[PDB]
Amino acid sequence: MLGNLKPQAPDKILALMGEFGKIDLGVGVYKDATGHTPIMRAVHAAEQRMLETETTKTYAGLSGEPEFQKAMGELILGDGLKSETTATLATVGGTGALRQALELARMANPDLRVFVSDPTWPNHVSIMNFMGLPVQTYRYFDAETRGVDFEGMKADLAAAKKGDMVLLHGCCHNPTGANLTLDQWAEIASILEKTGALPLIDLAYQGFGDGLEEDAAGTRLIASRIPEVLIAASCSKNFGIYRERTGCLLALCADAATRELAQGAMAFLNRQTYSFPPFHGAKIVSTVLTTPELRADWMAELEAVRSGMLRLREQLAGELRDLSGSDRFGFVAEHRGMFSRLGATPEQVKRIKEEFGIYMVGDSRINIAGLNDNTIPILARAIIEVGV
Amino acid sequence: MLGNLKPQAPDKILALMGEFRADPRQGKIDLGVGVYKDATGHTPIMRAVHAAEQRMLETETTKTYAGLSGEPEFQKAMGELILGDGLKSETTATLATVGGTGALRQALELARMANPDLRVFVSDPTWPNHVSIMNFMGLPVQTYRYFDAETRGVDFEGMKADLAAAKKGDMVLLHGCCHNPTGANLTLDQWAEIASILEKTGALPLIDLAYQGFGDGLEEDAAGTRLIASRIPEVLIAASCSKNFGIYRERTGCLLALCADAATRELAQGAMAFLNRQTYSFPPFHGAKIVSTVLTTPELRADWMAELEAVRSGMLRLREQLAGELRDLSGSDRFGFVAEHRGMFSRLGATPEQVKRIKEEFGIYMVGDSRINIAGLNDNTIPILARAIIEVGV
Numbered sequence: 129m130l131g132n133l134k135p136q137a138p139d140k141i142l143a144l145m146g147e148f149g150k151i152d153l154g155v156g157v158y159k160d161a162t163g164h165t166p167i168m169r170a171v172h173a174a175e176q177r178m179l180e181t182e183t184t185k186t187y188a189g190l191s192g193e194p195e196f197q198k199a200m201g202e203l204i205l206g207d208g209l210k211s212e213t214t215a216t217l218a219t220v221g222g223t224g225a226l227r228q229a230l231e232l233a234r235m236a237n238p239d240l241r242v243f244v245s246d247p248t249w250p251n252h253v254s255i256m257n258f259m260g261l262p263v264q265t266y267r268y269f270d271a272e273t274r275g276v277d278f279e280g281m282k283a284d285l286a287a288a289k290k291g292d293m294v295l296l297h298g299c300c301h302n303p304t305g306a307n308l309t310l311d312q313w314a315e316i317a318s319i320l321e322k323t324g325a326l327p328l329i330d331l332a333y334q335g336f337g338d339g340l341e342e343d344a345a346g347t348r349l350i351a352s353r354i355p356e357v358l359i360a361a362s363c364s365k366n367f368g369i370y371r372e373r374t375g376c377l378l379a380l381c382a383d384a385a386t387r388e389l390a391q392g393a394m395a396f397l398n399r400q401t402y403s404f405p406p407f408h409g410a411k412i413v414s415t416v417l418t419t420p421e422l423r424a425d426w427m428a429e430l431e432a433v434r435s436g437m438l439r440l441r442e443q444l445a446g447e448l449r450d451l452s453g454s455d456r457f458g459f460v461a462e463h464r465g466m467f468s469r470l471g472a473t474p475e476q477v478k479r480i481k482e483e484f485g486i487y488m489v490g491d492s493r494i495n496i497a498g499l500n501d502n503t504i505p506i507l508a509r510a511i512i513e514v515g516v
Numbered sequence: 517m518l519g520n521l522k523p524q525a526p527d528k529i530l531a532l533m534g535e536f537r538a539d540p541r542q543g544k545i546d547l548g549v550g551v552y553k554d555a556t557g558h559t560p561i562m563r564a565v566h567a568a569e570q571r572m573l574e575t576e577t578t579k580t581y582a583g584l585s586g587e588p589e590f591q592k593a594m595g596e597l598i599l600g601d602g603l604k605s606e607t608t609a610t611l612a613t614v615g616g617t618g619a620l621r622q623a624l625e626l627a628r629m630a631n632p633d634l635r636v637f638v639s640d641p642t643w644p645n646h647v648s649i650m651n652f653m654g655l656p657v658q659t660y661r662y663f664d665a666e667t668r669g670v671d672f673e674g675m676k677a678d679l680a681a682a683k684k685g686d687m688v689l690l691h692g693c694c695h696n697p698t699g700a701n702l703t704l705d706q707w708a709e710i711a712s713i714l715e716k717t718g719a720l721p722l723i724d725l726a727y728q729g730f731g732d733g734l735e736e737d738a739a740g741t742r743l744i745a746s747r748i749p750e751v752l753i754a755a756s757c758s759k760n761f762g763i764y765r766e767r768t769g770c771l772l773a774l775c776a777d778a779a780t781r782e783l784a785q786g787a788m789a790f791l792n793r794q795t796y797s798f799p800p801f802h803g804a805k806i807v808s809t810v811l812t813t814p815e816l817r818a819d820w821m822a823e824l825e826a827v828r829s830g831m832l833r834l835r836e837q838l839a840g841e842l843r844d845l846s847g848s849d850r851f852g853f854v855a856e857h858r859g860m861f862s863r864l865g866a867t868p869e870q871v872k873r874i875k876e877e878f879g880i881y882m883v884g885d886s887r888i889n890i891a892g893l894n895d896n897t898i899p900i901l902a903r904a905i906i907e908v909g910v
């Protein structure tokens with residue numbers, strides 16, 4: 129039996145995590161000045177309170193806990209949360225939210241295609257291939273301007289037929305760092321409504337872009353326009369609870385009847401995959417979000433992080449500038465998120481890691497959070513010497 | 517498009533729970549629960565577990581991404597708990613999953629990858645979530661005789677006669693111990709015979725281990741699992757930590773893939789890691805960390821085993837009380853099976869009419885297939901339940 133198993137290729141990001149004074153600029157995890165990803169204050173306070181209040185660990189709810197579903201929905205959709213038409217499913221991280229989203233959609237439409245961005249988070253395509261779902265890409269990144277090829281994106285999306293799904297990153301686009309503006313989001317809304325394609329929003333960095341509410345702007349706009357939308361959210365990054373594996377899937381529907389259908393289908397999906405969703409991380413989130421004192425502190429720490437990285441971006445672009453007179457490496461300061469695609473060709477990347485000891489994802493994706501004024505100059509010279 | 521979604525049926529648990537909660541009767545009983553409950557009808561958090569969570573709170577510095585297939589401490593601690601000294605890492609592939617269910621689903625996916633023409637054989641009856649998962653995946657499900665309705669024991673001749681029809685490559689699902697929902701279990705000699713059948717047919721055994729420690733003890737409950745692990749070169753084992761550790765909601769379990777050689781081990785381990793990544797990526801840390809901490813910390817380990825021990829003994833004497841009550845009431849040893857059955861559950865052998873006659877006449881609720889939870893009994897309940905059984909002529 130097991131001997132017939134075909135060997136499976138390594139994951140882009142996770143691979144370097146293993147192959148890793150070395151400078152780690154790979155895996156999408158935030159790190160403080162001392163190269164450590166700390167446990168957020170509000171999070172630590174939440175767990176302390178949990179240990180004291182919980183009296184049992186019995187089987188809880190199949191789709192998660194009501195407190196979690198309600199909290200997450202308000203965080204993402206703000207006052208646009210139409211409870212009577214929204215289904216919520218607690219999942220094993222954002223990745224699980226995506227999988228469940230793909231399974232739900234396929235159940236409803238056995239003949240669907242998925243339009244993903246060029247480029248996009250690698251696991252998006254691996255999972256789709258695994259499920260056997262036909263993937264279609266759409267122009268998003270402009271390797272020249274290092275921005276978004278909006279004209280090409282609209283061009284490609286216009287072909288989406290009713291029944292197709294279009295995957296968009298709610299904010300802080302992994303791995304490019306290039307993002308759409310609110311006006312651009314409104315145009316996509318037009319396209320989606322004209323074509324009737326079901327949009328699936330990957331929301332894994334709410335808080336790292338321009339703030340909690342602003343980062344959700346595009347998603348709230350799509351939800352206000354399109355009658356049926358899917359949102360897969362991850363609590364890993366913005367709550368700093370990566371290993372807890374907590375996130376959720378929101379299914380926005382047109383009528384209260386369809387909601388019940390989807391909610392049941394969602395609950396069924398958990399049952400056939402792993403039964404109940406993990407409680408610890410979800411419990412942490414609901415505790416932070418529902419406790420005013422804890423929310424305020426969380427918001428503050430998250431704001432501090434976002435600002436820090438934004439401060440690092442200026443520095444990096446500045447260093448490179450001094451090593452170029454006055455040119456092109458400014459995109460770094462315009463990119464919003466935790467990643468930024470440089471441009472270093474495949475061979476250039478390997479050379480940098482094997483010589484300068486700095487690990488960055490093959491497609492030149494660098495994690496700006498894992499950098500500081502003591503390593504920025506090193507990176508600056510490292511990429512300068514690697515030329516082009 | 518979501519409106520063209522076929523309506524998925526509700527769990528069923530909730531329905532029974534609602535029917536119960538709605539009953540205005542003051543002395544209604546609920547033996548349909550699927551979790552352990554103490555004398556006061558509560559599902560406590562085990563001591564060693566509460567101590568582990570405290571240790572973690574005071575010693576953990578980060579919650580970054582950890583291991584894709586679980587943590588080394590977890591994998592080793594679990595593997596040794598289940599297989600004891602018979603564990604050989606060079607051939608054992610391990611994967612941390614989201615609960616036992618996750619281990620099952622990942623086992624099915626793994627085997628289907630290895631053999632697309634896989635057929636699964638499950639017992640009659642089995643944990644209903646089993647067939648459900650298989651149906652969802654579209655795997656051919658075959659059944660083998662198991663529960664003898666007249667004696668409430670194992671119809672072994674039927675089991676082996678049916679299992680003889682399994683072909684090389686097919687998968688056979690065995691409950692390692694405390695057969696859910698029947699309570700009827702195989703003896704080591706019967707396991708030895710099953711081993712001979714599996715060897716002869718070349719079928720791959722999938723062992724569901726969700727109650728190690730609830731039957732006759734830790735080592736005793738793993739006996740059958742170990743016999744097969746040594747006899748059969750390729751074995752898959754799906755363990756759960758929900759019940760024996762009382763961490764139901766944490767969602768902790770693991771899939772062990774025993775392979776014929778080290779080359780196959782790396783091949784299996786790589787595929788298992790791939791499977792987690794394609795489903796939900798990294799597995800949940802908390803519950804697994806609690807477990808490994810308890811198993812590796814001597815003081816904790818000891819306290820945990822002592823608490824499990826007490827729990828097992830309590831349910832066992834509770835079975836004797838009921839069996840004795842029935843003995844005095846029937847004037848026969850007809851319900852002696854109650855005392856022989858091991859586990860948290862037991863099938864009375866009552867028909868749906870009987871099950872509902874008991875409910876409407878006695879206020880005692882139970883699963884439609886006459887499956888009761890021994891933990892839901894006590895000195896007050898046993899007398900009532902004993903009478904109900906005799907009264908409806910079960």
Ligand SMILES: *Cc1c(COP(=O)(O)O)cnc(C)c1O
Pocket residue numbers: 156220221222223224249297302330332362363364365370373374375796797
């Ligand atoms: C982090 C991330 C995910 C996955 O988050 P998990 O909680 O780790 O599963 C999904 N999509 C994108 C774009 C991400 O950046």
Ligand SMILES: *Cc1c(COP(=O)(O)O)cnc(C)c1O
Pocket residue numbers: 402403614615616617618643691696724726756757758764767768769
């Ligand atoms: C309880 C049980 C399971 C479930 O374990 P989880 O950790 O809750 O998924 C699996 N199989 C059997 C036979 C069980 O009794």
